[PDB]
Design a protein around this nucleic acid. Structure first.
Ligand code: ATP
Ligand code: GDP
Ligand code: MG
Length: 349
RNA sequence: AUGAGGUGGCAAGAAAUGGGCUACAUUUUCUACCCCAGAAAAACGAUAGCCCUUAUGAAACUUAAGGGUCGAAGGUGGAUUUAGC
């Protein structure tokens, strides 16, 4: 196999080859966001070989040819269910992290808009709501991912947490992040502050921010959360959602924004719906317009053959008839070269 | 008048019994979806009780639907017994 960890080597000629994430990179760059099925696959194989695909290569080429002076260009990976949008976004995230960018990764925007029973009224803004658990978990993950720049960045304004507690201007962003992580009740606010800070620092040229949000359509969709009066809650009424909406605006420069659509886990969306407009909604498409959509599709014959060979070399296909050409054709037909269906099918052979 | 007509009224539970529904959950519950999800998990569980509204009606206390409230018995059940090629 092409067991390669260098992100500056793989290119169009490496389409179909493999790209290895080292265990240190797996632990640091990806404390979250990796699909659970691939998390299990990594934990079993003891490897993190991502197949290099054309959409990921195109996104990498665009990010290499971009200029940070320009306002943040929005890229949107989209495709059919289980085509590899999340893992393409993860590949781009890892490449950018190795490029010493600052990775602002959202593992799943759907989690913040569904199944939350610890919602509280926001002290900073009585018209909004706070999700302490989600914010605390994301703050921990963000501190893990971007530790090296966490202390270097200086905050630009003084922020207050209580009548007694406040964060002074010029303090490290690590102070705010650790305040959010430890003091869970304020964590949501800290999240917004961090985002705000990052944005202006991106404008200041302090670093090269890469905003990575999976399931971006959840920002402008619908939330299943309810009020204390059993009333539905609009997405903008959540502080985290509003802050992420502000971050999605292209009114800042110093990097680029990369998002991945995901009907899986979305609310009030038909199963077969995958197109950008249908998943995003009119408001979502208007907010994201303009953007560059990148289509992620099923494996080609070369990619499917490479995946099958990778499974065989790891002895995952334990069935006796799997190495035969007939078994390969059966798997290709029953999966239609779809990466998720193929992996799920091979998980029990 | 053992005929005819009008007004009003029963119909409850000590209790046993037959049949049915819902369940006693994790192959489950909630939500989206209508099958690649996220949560819940000592909660699961009433179509019961009480209150309110609505529908029908001349009339609802006695009907039905919905909502609020309550969250109980129950934790896969003896001999026996039903049905299905
Ligand atoms: N480049 C790749 N190399 C190896 N496996 C891949 C690749 N892309 C996708 N997969 C497989 O796809 C599955 C996960 O799919 P993924 O989450 O990336 O796609 P998706 O369409 O964005 O998903 P979802 O709609 O659920 O958000 C895993 O089983 C993983 O092995
Ligand atoms: N607790 C606290 N939170 C802050 C402070 N400053 C900013 N924030 C957070 O950062 C966000 C501020 O966004 P802001 O720039 O005011 O956007 P706007 O509300 O639309 O004007 C809010 O969601 C707060 O949670 C502060 O001084 N204290
Ligand atoms: Mg009588």
């Amino acid at each position: 196999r092409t067991n390669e960890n260098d992100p500056a080597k793989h290119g169009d000629q490496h389409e179909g080859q493999h790209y290895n994430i080292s265990p240190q990179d797996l632990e640091t760059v990806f404390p979250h966001g990796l699909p659970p099925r691939f998390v299990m696959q990594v934990k079993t194989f003891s490897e993190a070989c991502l197949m290099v695909r054309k959409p990921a290569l195109e996104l990498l080429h665009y990010l290499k040819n971009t200029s940070f002076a320009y306002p943040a260009i929005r890229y949107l990976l989209y495709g059919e269910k289980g085509t590899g949008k999340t893992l393409s976004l993860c590949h781009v995230i890892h490449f950018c992290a190795k490029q010493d960018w600052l990775i602002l990764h959202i593992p799943d925007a759907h989690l913040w808009v569904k199944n939350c029973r610890d919602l509280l009224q926001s002290s900073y803004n009585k018209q909004r709501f706070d999700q302490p658990l989600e914010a605390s978990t994301w703050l921990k993950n963000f501190k893990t991912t971007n530790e090296r720049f966490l202390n270097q960045i200086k905050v630009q304004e003084k922020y207050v947490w209580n009548k007694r507690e406040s964060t002074e201007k010029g303090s490290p962003l690590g102070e705010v992040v650790e305040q959010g992580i430890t003091r869970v009740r304020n964590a949501t606010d800290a999240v917004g502050i961090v985002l705000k800070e990052l944005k202006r620092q991106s404008s200041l040229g302090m670093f090269h921010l890469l905003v990575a949000v999976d399931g971006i359509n959840a920002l402008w969709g619908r939330t299943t959360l309810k009020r204390e009066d059993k009333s539905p809650i609009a997405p903008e009424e959540l502080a985290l959602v509003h802050n992420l909406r502000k971050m999605m605006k292209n009114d800042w420069h110093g990097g680029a924004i990369v998002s991945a659509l995901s009907q899986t886990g979305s609310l009030f969306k038909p199963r077969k719906a995958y197109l950008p407009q249908e998943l995003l909604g009119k408001e979502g498409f208007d907010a994201l317009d303009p953007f560059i959509p990148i289509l992620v599709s099923n494996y080609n014959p070369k990619e499917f053959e490479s995946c099958i060979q990778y499974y065989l070399e790891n002895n995952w296909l334990q069935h006796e008839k799997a190495p035969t050409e007939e078994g390969k054709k059966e798997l290709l037909f029953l999966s239609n070269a779809n990466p998720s269906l193929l992996e799920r099918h091979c998980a029990y052979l």
